[PDB]
Design a protein around this ligand. Structure first.
Ligand code: CLA
Ligand code: CLA
Ligand code: CLA
Ligand code: CLA
Ligand code: CLA
Ligand code: CLA
Ligand code: CLA
Ligand code: CLA
Ligand code: CLA
Ligand SMILES: CC(/C=C/C=C(C)/C=C/[C@@]12O[C@]1(C)C[C@@H](O)CC2(C)C)=C\C=C\C=C(C)\C=C\C=C(C)\C=C\[C@@]12O[C@]1(C)C[C@@H](O)CC2(C)C
Ligand code: SF4
Lengths: 35, 41, 197, 734, 165, 67, 80
């Protein structure tokens, strides 16, 4: 139902730092993937 | 004379002559008919 | 075979030669194709007959003193008693609308399923009980007379429509107004037909 | 070489450069140019992509519902839809300072929140949503729908579930089903929901899924529908003194023709919209079974296309051969769909502000301005997309031997005449509009403004007088009772519509003056010029005199070199990319006109717009300078007000505009030589040459440079105008 | 009294604008001695302003809610309210002059092509020929419609340079 | 051989080649090659193209009379 | 790399080969032209697509055509 009060303190750093970082890591490994 | 006339017969010179002629005509018309907007004879 | 000219000395049409009611005409060169020509022929004949009947109704509703043709369907705005020469028929608007739609639909279906190009313009047979069309010359001159009276019928119907769109006076009142005061009262005195008179 | 990232392009895989990344993204969903691609595989990829876009749309609106319910004030806005502002989403930014946190606490919230301008509050209040739990369950249901659609796309992508080629090419059955089911029964179910929920909720009666199948929407109880007495539904409409939230002044009517606006909320009646959607559903269903399915009845598209040929060679072969042209070429269908949808959203933008369909939407000025601007910009973008994909159709899939002598072959035959006439009308409109504006500015500058030329827009005024506006006078229809238009419908919708159109407070047929006339002609100039550019790109797409073989070079190629005098920006893609600039200018003009006229209407100084829109000093000073005072004062050394974010994104938009200028003015040779010098610098340095690049750094392509400059230009344009519009409309209103 | 607008003579905002202009001209005039050239220049400007405001009135011009005169463009409506001289007559005059320009240019283009190096005649104009065609363009619509009648105004699609499809 | 494989030299011709710059244009025949090459008709044009040239070689089937 | 295509409208004037800055074209014997020469592209893998050969073509339209696509190290003009 209603999310807890610490949800803006967790999801915003997750989708602002951690999720873009792992996305760029996966994309960097995919760009330079060789045979 | 004819070489100078052909120089005056070039496109920029006759364009300049048209420019002074049209500008002077419109300016004298505006001066002797001060600020008209609607054709009323 | 040409019955006259809409302009004496105009350009003759090479395709509009073997035509009933040959009066040259066609300045816009419409119906040069033969199929379009015969389609225009049958359409003009149908419009002729319908304008014939419409002019008949408009004149007969007025010469008998029964009311305006434009005020004739005025019983159907909210529901009233219709009549035909004092017959006071009790027919609802839905019933007459449905039966008229059905009858006209099946009549148009039969006319479209005629499938005879000569008979589409002029069927004959059961539609000619008196049988005066057996003589070919009489048939030709009666075709010309029908076309002329039908053209007069459509221009008269257009005149009625325009007159009632301009002025509220009926047909007989307009005729009396033109007869009594033609110069002082005509189509130029309407003020709406010509923007500026 | 031959990396695995561009799996859809073997040639791009063997590219040892950074461009392989960029061309690996721009050509990502151009499946027609991919290696080893069949038509069936292309159709399956299109189906999967469509399901993906549907899932993304449903997830996005689910997120909007969830972020309105959680961290929002939907119930407080329901109680008082006039004073308190809607909340879009809460702000959690650790970079925020304490004065910035305190300044962003608006609408009675416990933290920093953003004032909602999308207008979903008014829409969800109009459709019957009242509680936050309803928004929560709607959001979770839409999330489930999005997950279902994504799984459906995955399953239809899987083997032994992929549709056949003839299944996709079955145009008649698709047309019949989408006309009858996607539009007919969808609208029927929507108006059923309207009747069941929204009218009782607007009349103070709660209708939910728990009490569903128990409360009768009409007290008669469906018996007039079976008895044919449909007029009994329009028996007791809501009174003028009716409250939207309560049952005061309520009635018993679900379908009526009460044309006009609700006096309390300045919006269209719910019963009127329900009747409209019911009639639309009936018209769609009765027209949704016209085409020839497997049954013996219906209409064949090809038969009607081939039979509709004018006689005597009016259009040559006529419309023959267009069925295979539409079916085989998907870009033709894409262009037709984008053009129709663009016209639809243009109509939506032009009809929302004049006829607000949502309760308490006209009072929310910033919401209406943002909605109109967004819809107009989307409309222009997909107008341009329709024309660009039409050019793509002309380049890629267009066989003149198939459609020989048809309408397409004819318009390709005399394309020079069409382009020349459009160029002439563009020159005519631009010359005279600029001459009039400069004349007015010079006349107003000389201190004698009465010498300016003010051509009265008599045509639009005559139309509005013919449609009920009695301000201009005249004696046309809907103004004189003797007219048949006045007599017809005198007791159906005329008394409400005349009252709505004779009021100057609402945006229904506002007063149009000479400045409105001039800006309308400017709009016409913009539309005609953008049309000229786009049809010149589309008609000269497959060939021209400078490049007869333009079809062999594809749709997006840079140039042919400096030969033949110079051949840069000769592709139809470049024509589209210039038309993007012209479309941006045109939508900027229409949005400037809308914003200034509506702002002067809301401030009550309509005379300021009437005497100030004539000359461009008024446009620059009374609109772009007077209304920007609150925007620029968002943050300053004195302090900060609530419009600090709008000032920041305004400067942000100006910055992205400048970066667009960077990527559009300078071209590839200078940056390539500079990149070579930087490559030498990285190669010949200690302590840094140990690392190396896997792909050689190269300058961006000329087409890529045009795309990047266009993207930066459009992003800066959109952000700048959105910032200015929202800051000007919300900084002084509410 | 069309379009819900009042005539300039009957309007109040027109007179208010004229009064404001006369007031600011008099304020500028009061800073100069009567025996100075700027005084005569400002007096001439005030006289021209008064003459223009008198000529704009009693000429059919009408203004709405701001004192700035408005122009009616629809023919017929301008004909029945004496507003044809606003735009209707000037548009016909401009069409006449534009047709004069087009006919003179067409005559110079055609008449300078049946000779060696027509580009030389294009770049160095034959001034007597140009003046002769200038004074022969007074009957441009007659010659234009006659060239349309004989078909020399338009070129056939077989001799016209055309782009590939 | 008999007569000549092409038109008379110095006579005006109209180019029927659609991809040429001088489509539906009048040019002058300079010389016609008789060896049997694909485009023997050398045509000189009064107006130059974008490349600045004024001569081109055309085949026998793409030249007609000036209409 | 790029695709260089030469048609039969070439007159064998050898201007395209002289204008080539990477030695892509060549002259082969021919019988379809007066000069008995025909342009060829046996080294199209070294062509960068500079379109210098198209500038030097004297014939109307183009007797030699360069089509870009599938850029490589040699085709991108890279010294690195
Ligand atoms: C009563 C007489 C009559 C009239 C008035 C027409 C008139 C027409 N019929 Mg026709 N028709 C007739 C008899 C008639 N027909 C007959 C006897 C038959 C045999 C049964 C047909 C069978 C027939 C068929 C089967 C079809 C027509 C169609 C048409 C239309 C197109 C004709 C055409 O070639 O384009 C006119 C000629 C041109 C060369 C077109 C030029 C168009 C220009 C270039 C466009 C200019 C646009 C411009 C930018 C606009 C500026 C405005 C600005 C505000 C933007 C036209 C309205 C077609 C249709 O439905 O189209 C609506 C069609 O498919 N007719
Ligand atoms: C606000 C800036 C601006 C202006 C005024 C123009 C003006 C013009 N562009 Mg546009 N354009 C611009 C920016 C601008 N462009 C940008 C940024 C782009 C994106 C790259 C484009 C992309 C673009 C395309 C793709 C096309 C145009 C076209 C046109 C013409 C439209 C015809 C018209 O409206 O009548 C003319 C109106 C004008 C305002 C032109 C200016 C003329 C005034 C009156 C001055 C004339 C000289 C004056 C008498 C002074 C003389 C002395 C002086 C020379 C010293 C016109 C020449 C179209 C075209 O060529 O028409 C066929 C076209 O296809 N432009
Ligand atoms: C959207 C995601 C996101 C999030 C959640 C953050 C979060 C944060 N950034 Mg920000 N930042 C972001 C994106 C983001 N950044 C981007 C995209 C940029 C580039 C434009 C920056 C540029 C930036 C600068 C330049 C600075 C920050 C700083 C900070 C911190 C604020 C000061 C503070 O609390 O002390 C930090 C308190 C902590 C408990 C963090 C320490 C624990 C770490 C994670 C280990 C905070 C942790 C400041 C900072 O960290 O100061 C050193 C600071 O000076 N950020
Ligand atoms: C394209 C739009 C347009 C139009 C319709 C007009 C039309 C007019 N303006 Mg304007 N003007 C324009 C553009 C335009 N101008 C521009 C771009 C500028 C800035 C350079 C000006 C600057 C300007 C000034 C400063 C003045 C005008 C004036 C005038 C009047 C013409 C006076 C004249 O030439 O003598 C009439 C000449 C003829 C009729 C020629 C006759 C030749 C033979 C006999 C035919 C007329 C109301 C003057 C006026 O009276 O104000 C109302 C005036 O004072 N205008
Ligand atoms: C119904 C919608 C629709 C559909 C299905 C398509 C589908 C297609 N179009 Mg079309 N198009 C559309 C709408 C549509 N388009 C619209 C609205 C426009 C006008 C803008 C265009 C303009 C257009 C052009 C000009 C071209 C296509 C092309 C293509 C193809 C390439 C797509 C692909 O796989 O690459 C995927 C492509 C990308 C991922 C690139 C997208 C990059 C965007 C611009 C970045 C977003 C901007 C910005 C940075 C976002 C951040 C904002 C910031 C504030 C944070 C494909 C056939 C191309 C084609 O057929 O190739 C020859 C082509 O040349 N289209
Ligand atoms: C009556 C039955 C029916 C219904 C309701 C739908 C409904 C839909 N189909 Mg369709 N479709 C049908 C039968 C039907 N289909 C049949 C019988 C065929 C085969 C001939 C297809 C072939 C088909 C294709 C090929 C595609 C669709 C797509 C779509 C979606 C369009 C997006 C949308 O909702 O627009 C919303 C419109 C408004 C809000 C207005 C929608 C869910 C598209 C899709 O996958 O989703 C995008 C798509 O690409 N349909
Ligand atoms: C240093 C100068 C400078 C520059 C280069 C820019 C650059 C920009 N500003 Mg900014 N601006 C600046 C300083 C500057 N700014 C300052 C100091 C202020 C005061 C605070 C503003 C106030 C401001 C506002 C209020 C707006 C901008 C906008 C813009 C953008 C221009 C939009 C565009 O190209 O549309 C092309 C231009 C137009 C479409 C219209 C031009 C304006 C005219 C006068 C309106 C009248 C047009 C009307 C239809 C009649 C004309 C018809 C025609 C035929 C004659 C761009 C990001 C706008 C934006 O973000 O995008 C819309 C915007 O709304 N700026
Ligand atoms: C297509 C452009 C256009 C438009 C929108 C109008 C619009 C108008 N004209 Mg006009 N008109 C035009 C071109 C146009 N005119 C042209 C080219 C002429 C011929 C020179 C006329 C001749 C004309 C006359 C003679 C009359 C109108 C009248 C009218 C009005 C009502 C028209 C109607 O049917 O009722 C309306 C303001 C009428 C009017 O003033 O209202 C009663 C009227 O009497 N017009
Ligand atoms: C007198 C020669 C002449 C003539 C008869 C035409 C005729 C035409 N042009 Mg062209 N034009 C000309 C010169 C001419 N043009 C020049 C010099 C230019 C370069 C500026 C153009 C640029 C041009 C464009 C860009 C367009 C036209 C278009 C048109 C058509 C619309 C009519 C019109 O007013 O367009 C408007 C024309 C102009 C605004 C150009 C006016 C240029 C100057 C002011 C006139 C020069 C007069 C000349 C000095 C007289 C010489 C007389 C001699 C004795 C010295 C029409 C076929 C349009 C079209 O395709 O319509 C289908 C179109 O889009 N023209
Ligand atoms: C059928 C018709 C009228 C039908 C009337 C009916 C049913 C009337 C019925 C009723 O009235 C009654 C009895 C009583 C009322 O209470 C009720 C109603 C119901 C109202 C009119 C046709 C009317 C037909 C008309 C007016 C035709 C006009 C044709 C024109 C102008 C032709 C133009 C061209 O000739 C040019 C100019 C140049 C050439 O190149 C080209 C062409 C095309 C040939
Ligand atoms: S786009 Fe660049 S390389 Fe091509 S013609 Fe233009 S300047 Fe030359």
């Amino acid at each position: 139902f209603v999310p807890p009060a610490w949800a803006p303190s967790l999801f915003v750093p997750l989708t602002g730092l951690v999720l873009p970082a792992i996305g760029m890591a996966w994309a960097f490994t995919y760009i330079q993937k060789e045979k | 004379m004819k070489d100078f006339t052909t120089y005056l017969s070039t496109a920029p010179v006759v364009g300049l002559g048209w420019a002074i002629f049209t500008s002077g005509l419109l300016i004298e018309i505006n001066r002797f008919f001060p600020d008209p907007l609607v054709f009323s004879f | 075979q040409r019955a006259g000219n809409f302009a004496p000395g105009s350009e003759p049409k090479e395709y509009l030669n073997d035509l009933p009611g040959n009066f040259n005409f066609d300045p816009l060169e419409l119906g040069k194709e033969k199929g379009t020509l015969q389609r225009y022929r049958e359409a003009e004949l149908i419009h002729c007959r319908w304008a014939m009947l419409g002019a008949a109704g408009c004149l007969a509703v007025e010469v008998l003193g029964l009311g305006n043709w434009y005020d004739a369907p005025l019983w159907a705005v909210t529901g009233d008693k219709p009549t035909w020469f004092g017959i006071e028929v009790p027919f609802d608007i839905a019933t007459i609308l449905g039966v008229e739609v059905v009858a006209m639909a099946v009549a148009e279906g039969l006319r479209n399923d005629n499938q005879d190009m000569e008979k589409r313009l002029y069927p004959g047979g059961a539609f000619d009980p008196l049988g005066f069309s057996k003589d070919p010359k009489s048939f030709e001159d009666k075709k010309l007379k029908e076309l002329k009276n039908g053209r007069l019928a459509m221009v008269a119907c257009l005149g009625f429509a325009g007159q009632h769109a301009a002025t509220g006076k009926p047909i007989l009142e307009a005729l009396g107004d033109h007869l009594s005061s033609p110069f002082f009262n005509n189509f130029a005195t309407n003020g709406v037909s010509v923007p500026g008179v | 070489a031959t990396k695995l990232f561009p799996k859809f392009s073997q040639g791009l895989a063997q590219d040892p450069s950074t461009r392989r990344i960029w061309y690996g993204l721009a050509t990502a969903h151009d499946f027609e140019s991919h290696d080893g691609m069949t038509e069936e595989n292309l159709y399956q990829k299109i189906f999967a992509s469509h399901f993906g876009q549907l899932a993304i749309i449903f997830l996005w609106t689910s997120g909007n519902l969830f972020h309105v319910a959680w961290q929002g004030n939907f119930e407080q806005w329901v109680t008082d839809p006039i004073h308190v502002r809607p909340i879009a989403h809460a702000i959690w930014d650790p970079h925020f300072g304490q004065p910035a946190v305190e300044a962003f606490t608006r609408g009675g919230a416990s933290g920093p929140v953003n004032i909602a301008t999308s207008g979903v509050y008014q829409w969800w209040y109009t459709i019957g949503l009242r509680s936050n739990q309803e928004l929560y369950v709607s959001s979770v249901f839409l999330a489930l729908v999005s997950a279902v659609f994504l799984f459906a796309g995955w399953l239809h992508l899987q083997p032994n579930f992929q549709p056949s080629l003839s299944w996709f090419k079955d145009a008649e059955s698709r047309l019949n089903h989408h006309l009858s089911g996607l539009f007919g029964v969808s609208s029927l179910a929507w108006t059923g929901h309207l009747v069941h929920v929204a009218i009782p909720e607007s009349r103070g009666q709660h209708v939910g899924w728990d009490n569903f199948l128990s409360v009768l929407p009409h007290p008669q109880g469906l018996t007039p529908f079976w008895s044919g007495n449909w007029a009994a539904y329009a028996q007791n409409p809501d009174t003028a003194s009716h409250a939207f939230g309560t049952a005061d002044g309520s009635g018993t009517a679900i379908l009526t023709f009460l044309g006009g606006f609700h006096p309390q909320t300045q919006s269209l009646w719910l019963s009127d919209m329900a009747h409209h959607h019911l009639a639309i559903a009936v018209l769609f269903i009765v027209a949704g079974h016209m085409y020839r399915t497997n049954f013996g009845i219906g209409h064949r598209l090809e038969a009607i296309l081939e039979a509709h040929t004018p006689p005597a060679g009016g259009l040559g072969a006529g419309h023959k051969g267009l069925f295979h042209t539409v079916n085989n070429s998907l870009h033709f269908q894409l262009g037709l769909a984008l053009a129709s949808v663009g016209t639809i959203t243009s109509l939506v933008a032009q009809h929302m502000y004049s006829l607000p369909p949502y309760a308490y939407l006209a009072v929310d000025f910033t919401t209406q301005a943002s909605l109109y601007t967004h819809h107009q910009y989307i409309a222009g973008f997909i107008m341009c997309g329709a024309f660009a994909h039409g050019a793509i159709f002309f380049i890629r899939d267009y066989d003149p031997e198939q459609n020989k002598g048809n309408v397409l072959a004819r318009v390709l035959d005399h394309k020079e005449a069409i382009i020349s006439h459009l160029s002439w009308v563009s020159l005519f409109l631009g010359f005279h509009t600029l001459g009039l504006y400069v004349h007015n500015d010079v006349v107003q500058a000389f201190g004698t403004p009465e010498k300016q030329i003010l051509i009265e827009p008599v045509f639009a005024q005559w139309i509005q007088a013919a449609q009920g506006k009695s301000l201009y006078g005249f004696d046309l229809l809907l103004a004189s009772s003797s007219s048949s238009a006045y007599s017809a419908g005198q007791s159906l919708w005329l008394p409400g519509w005349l009252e709505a159109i004779n009021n100057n407070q609402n945006s229904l047929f506002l007063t149009i003056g000479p400045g409105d006339f001039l800006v309308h002609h400017a709009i016409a100039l913009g539309l005609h010029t953008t049309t000229l550019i786009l049809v010149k790109g589309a008609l000269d797409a497959r060939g021209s005199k400078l490049m007869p073989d333009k079809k062999d070079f594809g749709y997006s190629f840079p140039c042919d070199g400096p030969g033949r005098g110079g051949t840069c920006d000769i592709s139809a893609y470049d024509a589209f990319y210039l038309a993007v600039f012209w479309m941006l200018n045109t939508i900027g003009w229409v949005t400037f006109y809308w914003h200034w006229k509506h702002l002067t209407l809301w401030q009550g100084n309509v005379s300021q717009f009437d005497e100030s829109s004539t000359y461009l000093m008024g446009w620059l000073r009374d609109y772009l300078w007077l209304n920007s005072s609150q925007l620029i004062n968002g943050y300053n050394p004195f302090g900060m007000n609530s419009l600090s974010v709008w000032a920041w994104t305004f400067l942000f938009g100006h910055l992205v505009y400048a970066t667009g200028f960077m990527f559009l003015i300078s071209w590839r040779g200078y940056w390539q030589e500079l990149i070579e010098t930087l490559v030498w610098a990285h190669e010949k340095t200690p302590l840094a040459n140990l690392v190396y690049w896997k792909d050689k750094p190269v300058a961006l392509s000329i087409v890529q440079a045009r795309l990047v400059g266009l993207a930066h230009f459009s992003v800066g344009y959109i952000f700048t105008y959105a910032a200015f519009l929202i800051a000007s409309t919300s900084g002084r209103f509410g | 009294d069309v379009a819900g607008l009042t005539p300039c003579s009957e309007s109040k905002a027109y007179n208010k604008l004229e009064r404001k202009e006369l007031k600011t001209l008099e304020k500028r005039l009061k800073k100069y001695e009567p025996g100075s050239a700027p005084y005569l220049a400002l007096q001439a400007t005030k006289e021209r302003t008064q003459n223009r405001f008198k000529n704009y009135a009693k000429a059919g011009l009408l203004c709405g809610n701001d004192g700035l005169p408005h122009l009616i463009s629809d023919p017929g409506l301008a004909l029945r309210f004496n507003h044809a001289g606003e735009v209707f007559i000037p548009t016909f005059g401009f069409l006449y002059v534009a047709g004069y320009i087009g006919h003179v240019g067409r005559q110079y283009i055609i008449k300078s092509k049946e000779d060696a190096k027509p580009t030389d005649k294009e770049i160095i104009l034959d001034v007597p020929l140009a003046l002769q065609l200038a004074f022969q363009g007074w009957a441009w619509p007659l010659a234009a419609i006659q060239e349309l009648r004989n078909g020399s105004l338009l070129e056939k699609d077989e001799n016209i340079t055309v782009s590939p499809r | 051989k008999k007569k000549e494989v092409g038109p008379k030299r110095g006579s005006l011709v109209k180019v029927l080649r659609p991809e040429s710059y001088w489509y539906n244009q009048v040019g002058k025949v300079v010389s016609v090659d008789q060896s049997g090459i694909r485009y023997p008709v050398v045509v000189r044009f009064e107006n130059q193209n974008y490349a600045g040239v004024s001569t081109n070689n055309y085949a026998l089937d793409e030249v007609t009379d000036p209409p | 790399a790029h695709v260089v295509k030469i048609y039969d409208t070439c007159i064998g004037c050898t201007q395209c080969v002289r204008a080539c800055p990477l030695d892509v074209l060549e002259m082969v014997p021919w019988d379809g032209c007066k000069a008995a020469q025909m342009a060829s592209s046996p080294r199209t893998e070294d062509c960068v697509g500079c379109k210098r050969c198209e500038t030097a073509c004297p014939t109307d339209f183009l007797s030699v055509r360069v089509y870009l696509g599938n850029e490589s190290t040699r085709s991108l003009g890279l010294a690195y």
